[PDB]
């Protein structure tokens, strides 16, 4: 849906004389701007409580910045996604430096493997995998081995003119 930000979004249930100060629910929402995030907030609240944006109020909207944006983290992810023939929960694992970077390639993955456009996916939970060997998925586990190294064989250099006088070398 774009390059993502994360948003604390807080809203409540409009006041009534008989019930002033209603109950205040928060959600974290991944959106590309604050207008989507508020629409998205109201999308889920109508899926849980009896409210709709008309009868309710957004109390506050705040961006959440990654706590340690230069530290590599292993993320487990929890997703509910409609498919053509029916809806299914999932758990994937994503290794990256920010929750926002994580959510970005999640949505990219759900589109490439499962053909799921943004409207189908629900983010259920994203949380930092704390101890390793709570990493459960082999494509991440590959990258946790001690003293890891790999070559990048068959290197391809982008040419800047239509002709070359040499002959390329994929050496590296």
């Amino acid at each position: 849906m774009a390059h993502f930000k994360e948003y604390q979004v807080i809203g409540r249930r409009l006041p009534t004389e008989s019930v002033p100060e209603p109950k205040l629910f928060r959600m974290r929402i991944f959106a590309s701007n604050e207008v989507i995030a508020k629409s998205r907030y109201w999308y889920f609240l109508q899926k849980l409580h009896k409210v709709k944006k008309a009868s309710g109020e957004i109390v506050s909207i705040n961006q959440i910045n990654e706590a340690h944006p230069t530290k590599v983290k292993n993320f487990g992810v929890w997703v509910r996604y409609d498919s053509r023939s029916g809806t299914h929960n999932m758990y994937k694992e994503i290794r990256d430096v920010s929750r926002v970077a994580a959510v970005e390639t999640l949505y990219q993955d759900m589109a490439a493997r499962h053909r799921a456009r943004f409207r189908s996916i629900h983010i259920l939970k994203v949380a930092e995998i704390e101890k390793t060997a709570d990493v459960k998925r082999q494509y991440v586990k590959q990258f946790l081995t001690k003293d890891l190294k790999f070559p990048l064989p068959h290197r391809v250099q982008k040419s800047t003119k239509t002709f070359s006088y040499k002959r390329p070398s994929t050496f590296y």
Binding site: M1, N33, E34, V35, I36, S39
Partner: peptide, 14 residues
């Protein structure tokens, strides 16, 4: 709509 990645409707401060 704006939320849908188009241009129409209320886009607020944008």
């Amino acid at each position: 709509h704006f939320i849908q990645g188009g241009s129409f409707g209320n886009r607020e401060e944008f």
